[PDB]
Amino acid sequence: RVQLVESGGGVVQPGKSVRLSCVVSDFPFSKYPMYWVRQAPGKGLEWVAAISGDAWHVVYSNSVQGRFLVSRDNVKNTLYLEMNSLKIEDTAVYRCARMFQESGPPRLDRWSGRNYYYYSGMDVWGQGTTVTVSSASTKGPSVFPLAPSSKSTSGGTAALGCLVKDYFPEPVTVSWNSGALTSGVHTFPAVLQSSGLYSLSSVVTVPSSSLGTQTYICNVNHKPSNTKVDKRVEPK
Amino acid sequence: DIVMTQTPLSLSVTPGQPASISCKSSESLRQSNGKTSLYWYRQKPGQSPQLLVFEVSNRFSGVSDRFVGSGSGTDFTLRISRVEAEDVGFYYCMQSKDFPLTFGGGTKVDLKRTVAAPSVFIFPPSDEQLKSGTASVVCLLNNFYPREAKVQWKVDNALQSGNSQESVTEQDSKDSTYSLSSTLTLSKADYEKHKVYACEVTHQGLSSPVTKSFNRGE
Numbered sequence: 001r002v003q004l005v006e007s008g009g010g011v012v013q014p015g016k017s018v019r020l021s022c023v024v025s026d027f028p029f030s031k032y033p034m035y036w037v038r039q040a041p042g043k044g045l046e047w048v049a050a051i052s053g054d055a056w057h058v059v060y061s062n063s064v065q066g067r068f069l070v071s072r073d074n075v076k077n078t079l080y081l082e083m084n085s086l087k088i089e090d091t092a093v094y095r096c097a098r099m100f101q102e103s104g105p106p107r108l109d110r111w112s113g114r115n116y117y118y119y120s121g122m123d124v125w126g127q128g129t130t131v132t133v134s135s136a137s138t139k140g141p142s143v144f145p146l147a148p149s150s151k152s153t154s155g156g157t158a159a160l161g162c163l164v165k166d167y168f169p170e171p172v173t174v175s176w177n178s179g180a181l182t183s184g185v186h187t188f189p190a191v192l193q194s195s196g197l198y199s200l201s202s203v204v205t206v207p208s209s210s211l212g213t214q215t216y217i218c219n220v221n222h223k224p225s226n227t228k229v230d231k232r233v234e235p236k
Numbered sequence: 237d238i239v240m241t242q243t244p245l246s247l248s249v250t251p252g253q254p255a256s257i258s259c260k261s262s263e264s265l266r267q268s269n270g271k272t273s274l275y276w277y278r279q280k281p282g283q284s285p286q287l288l289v290f291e292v293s294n295r296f297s298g299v300s301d302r303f304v305g306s307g308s309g310t311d312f313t314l315r316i317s318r319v320e321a322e323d324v325g326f327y328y329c330m331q332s333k334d335f336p337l338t339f340g341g342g343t344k345v346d347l348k349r350t351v352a353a354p355s356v357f358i359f360p361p362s363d364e365q366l367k368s369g370t371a372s373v374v375c376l377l378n379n380f381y382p383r384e385a386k387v388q389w390k391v392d393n394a395l396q397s398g399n400s401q402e403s404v405t406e407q408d409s410k411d412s413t414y415s416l417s418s419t420l421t422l423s424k425a426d427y428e429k430h431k432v433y434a435c436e437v438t439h440q441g442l443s444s445p446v447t448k449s450f451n452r453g454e
Binding site for chain 1 (some may be wrong): 290296326330335340357365368404419
């Protein structure tokens, strides 16, 4: 029943600031050191910051030191990450995590086993909150057909699709024929282009004999630009 | 920093079969208190990481004894004695001996199946796009296994660099295959400069690399 819930993520211009929160439940918060760890799109985990149970000791990764500030409120059982001077490379899902065991302030007295705060591995992680740092402006996608042809047909099966190009920010949703057609559909992960705009493709394979007897429409929804496109894909 | 070197980078497993992932640290993770600060996490697609094993060899509550962690100093292993199909995903080691906390590069575990060659399709840019001033050419590799594939673009036989991007679907839950899309992007002016657009595909399911191509305007 231990749970961590992050919030505060969003789309941010480089150089600007954002504050993340992590509200926790079902454990004595002040007894636990807490962590922030991030995960860039398609990448591994990267530790960002740590704070002792009593908030007297903090540590940062080299990549964020001087830009981020970790703090906690032991009255409200909330952990914070203030993210300043944001860079594009800060784009990531940010997760709160709890040290797997309690650990308190050092005893510089009555023993000498450690004169520093002790940190160990995390057990529970939150679902995370996404921070996307970009100079891009909101932009609706262009939806281009990937037309079926001889170059996409073999043995009575044709491939066709849509290219959902040049949009910002994520996400877009794509379906075929109002979501009724899912068999043979592959919708690929979006890629971020050098322009700073995303692009993604969705394809489907169907009988080539059906190209004249069946309508294939890709339904594209990009909520941030309020764009809804229903693109009919036909042989050229 | 303590650097974590995790191997292998990818592992295809047969269900019911054992599996081993290794982690080497750039220095000893043994602490003064006698514990060794090495942790194993798993992350399924779309999910947050979950702790499997703490301090080298201790299973986190709820984790079955299929998972066995071993090692000391700089050398560690996580073994799955029998592999079930639900174990697919990314596994990461982590150390907390010193700051920064550091993770291994990860191991992607997928399900092994028989080799399946990709069906390869090519798509010229639409007239609509050309009107806007850019041309995207798309190559689709459909339903293949294993994941390892090489896709290169040739334009009038000239190898393309720096103007393509690809992405790949998650392993299919029904047939265990992958699909991949590669997009070559050029300005309209550049697209109009050349004639033949070709996608060259190398995959172990294919006896020789396959090339799909078209002539611009046809």
